[PDB]
């Protein structure tokens with residue numbers, strides 16, 4: 159059985175208990191904390207690509223009002239984010255299981271851009287999600303995993319200074 163776990167969940171949970179925020183810029187900003195995934199139960203000899211996307215956790219716009227995040231009253235349907243291919247992809251199961259799969263080079267943007275960067279909507283709440291795609295083999299297979307612990311609101315600047323402080327303390 160394929161097992162997927164979050165590395166450094168301890169630290170993600172500190173961010174989550176304050177409501178996590180991730181900066182988006184026109185050129186695109188790397189994530190802190192970085193999503194790192196523990197994977198076991200792959201076929202060491204089979205070929206796989208690791209994909210990352212962001213699910214809109216709800217259909218609302220959020221605003222930091224008097225020291226607290228509060229949703230708008232006018233939901234709109236969100237639509238899927240684009241997919242980021244882990245740059246090690248494609249690769250052997252052995253490669254992926256030898257150390258945590260680290261998405262350190264994904265950049266989050268607010269503007270439709272050349273390539274690589276993933277465009278999110280500012281002030282929407284997102285749940286990171288990976289897909290492990292068995293490729294090259296006869297039977298293509300996908301396994302998906304969500305990381306509730308890694309939820310964040312996309313922001314053009316930090317609103318909760320408690321988040322600013324945690325980001326600096328641990329980077």
Ligand SMILES: O=C(c1ccco1)N1CCN(C(=O)C2CC2)CC1
Pocket residue numbers: 206207208243247248291293
């Ligand atoms: O690992 C995969 C893959 C397998 C299944 C879905 O994607 N690929 C896709 C295409 N590739 C590219 O062209 C580079 C990105 C520009 C990178 C390798």
